[PDB]
Design a protein around this ligand. Structure first.
Ligand SMILES: Cc1nsc(N(C)CC(N)=O)c1C#N
Ligand SMILES: Cc1nsc(N(C)CC(N)=O)c1C#N
Ligand SMILES: [Zn+2]
Ligand SMILES: [Zn+2]
Ligand SMILES: [Zn+2]
Length: 461
């Protein structure tokens, strides 16, 4: 019960316009054969081209929407569309490209998938709303066989060259002409009524149809992400490390302690309302304040309405207007003015951030968190939190070479007294590095308007 059995049934109703007469009774085994491939009863780690929803979900970083449309099968030119927004035209003889034979079109397909996937995944998962021409066009740019390794490294092979008779991973595939052991999944097997557009458009206003292949390709992956990460959410699934996940997570813990510790020292709030992750611990355990926790899961769909988060069954609702509210990745429509806020900017370009549904994004760092579209209007009662470092810790090296530090934002006893000590200079530069890691990773920080670092200087006297 791990891999999809080739003897599992495939519903063929979706195929019967491109492929009139298709059997109603069809397995993957007979489908794969009809697509022109031979699985030669092989136990070499590639039991099926098609995969389970669960396997697709574990390999979300690999998803590429794929769609083909008749343009004017062997007779006529095909439009090949990918969720990268690329459209190629193959002949048998937003980016749109002119008609070319399969022998060159297939080279472009390897280049495009390699550049897209090399920093994301060991594989490709073609995500389909299958009507026939996509499945019957794969023989023109795919080869299958036993699992294999790169000729230049230890990564599993994803490409093949007919020039050299060799195999490559995504990193090493320059000049390769065939996709090797792709995976794929037909969204239409999941139990949907009506066409792609009419299902996509229930959930997403951001992707339009121009009746071109890359738009269906984009809409297909959008609808898949909706089904697997918005309506359904499995926070048990771990995902591999592929970048700065560990540094970014550590940065986030450091900045949070810094910012909340400072907020308490500056304005001496008697109560902090900690709204979000129900696992959460006091980020400033030594602080003087009444720490009151409030449970809420990541909203993956729409931002929480502050009205419904606080004052539903307001049967003596807690005084959320007293003290300060901490929303650490707890997304609401409009934050109260007495708030400290970390909010992920869905618009960021990174290897951890994949395009999502209805202007939102899928942030994959240890877990997958689909995140509602970033909206500036959420922050109207707040301001951007300016950078600063604060320490009450004694000046004392205990031991990373030095250039004497000058900064207006180094809030320490030493800088008050004129000259930053070596210890606080190291800590300052380390904290600035963490802070920049975090920001570039896409997190944005916002605070109550009365917040002023000038108030921190009187905590040394
Ligand atoms: C008493 C109580 N039950 S529910 C609740 N909140 C804040 C959540 C909500 N949805 O209103 C409170 C409080 N305080
Ligand atoms: C890294 C992280 N920790 S919890 C979280 N949430 C609540 C997801 C969200 N929907 O905003 C994020 C993000 N991003
Ligand atoms: Zn390699
Ligand atoms: Zn969409
Ligand atoms: Zn110092």
């Amino acid at each position: 019960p791990t891999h999809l059995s080739v003897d599992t049934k495939f519903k063929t109703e979706g195929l019967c316009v491109d492929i009139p007469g298709i059997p109603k009774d069809m397995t993957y085994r007979r489908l794969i054969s009809m697509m022109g491939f031979k699985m030669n009863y092989q136990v070499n780690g590639y039991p099926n081209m098609f995969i389970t929803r669960e396997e697709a979900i574990r390999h979300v970083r690999a998803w590429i929407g794929f769609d083909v449309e008749g343009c004017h099968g062997t007779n006529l030119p095909l439009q090949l569309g990918f969720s990268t927004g690329v459209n190629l035209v193959a002949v048998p003889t937003p980016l749109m490209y002119k008609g070319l034979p399969w022998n060159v079109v297939r080279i472009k397909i390897v280049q495009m998938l390699s550049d897209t996937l090399k920093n994301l995944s060991d594989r490709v998962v073609f995500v389909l709303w299958a009507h026939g021409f996509e499945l019957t066009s794969m023989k023109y740019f795919v080869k299958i066989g036993p699992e294999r390794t790169c000729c230049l490294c230890d990564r599993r092979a994803t490409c093949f060259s007919t020039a050299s008779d060799t195999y490559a991973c995504w990193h090493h595939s320059i000049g390769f002409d065939y996709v090797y052991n792709p995976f794929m999944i037909d969204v239409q097997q999941w139990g949907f009524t009506g066409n792609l557009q009419s299902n996509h458009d229930l959930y997403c206003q951001v992707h339009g149809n121009a009746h071109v292949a890359s738009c269906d390709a984009i809409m297909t992956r959008c609808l898949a992400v909706h089904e697997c990460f918005v309506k359904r959410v499995d926070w048990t699934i771990e995902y591999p490390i592929i970048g700065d996940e560990l540094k970014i997570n550590a940065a986030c813990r450091k900045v949070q302690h810094m910012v909340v510790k400072a907020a308490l020292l500056a304005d001496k709030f008697p109560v902090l309302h900690d709204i979000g992750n129900p696992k959460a611990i006091k980020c400033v355990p030594q602080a003087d304040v009444e720490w009151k926790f409030y449970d809420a899961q990541p909203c993956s769909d729409k931002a929480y309405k502050i009205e419904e988060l606080f004052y539903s069954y307001a049967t003596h609702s807690d005084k959320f207007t007293d003290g300060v509210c901490l929303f650490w990745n707890c997304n609401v429509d409009r934050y109260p003015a007495n708030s400290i806020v970390c909010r992920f900017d869905t618009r960021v370009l990174s290897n951890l951030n994949l395009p999502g549904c209805d202007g939102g994004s899928l942030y994959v760092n240890k877990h997958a968190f689909h995140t509602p579209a970033f909206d500036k209007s959420a922050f109207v009662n707040l301001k951007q939190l300016p950078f600063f470092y604060y320490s009450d810790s004694p000046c004392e090296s205990h031991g990373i070479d030095y250039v004497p530090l000058k900064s207006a934002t180094c809030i320490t006893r030493c800088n008050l007294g004129g000259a930053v000590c070596r210890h606080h200079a190291n800590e300052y530069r380390l904290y600035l590095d963490a802070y920049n890691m975090m920001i570039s990773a896409g997190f944005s920080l916002w605070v109550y308007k009365q917040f002023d670092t000038y108030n921190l200087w009187n905590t040394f006297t």
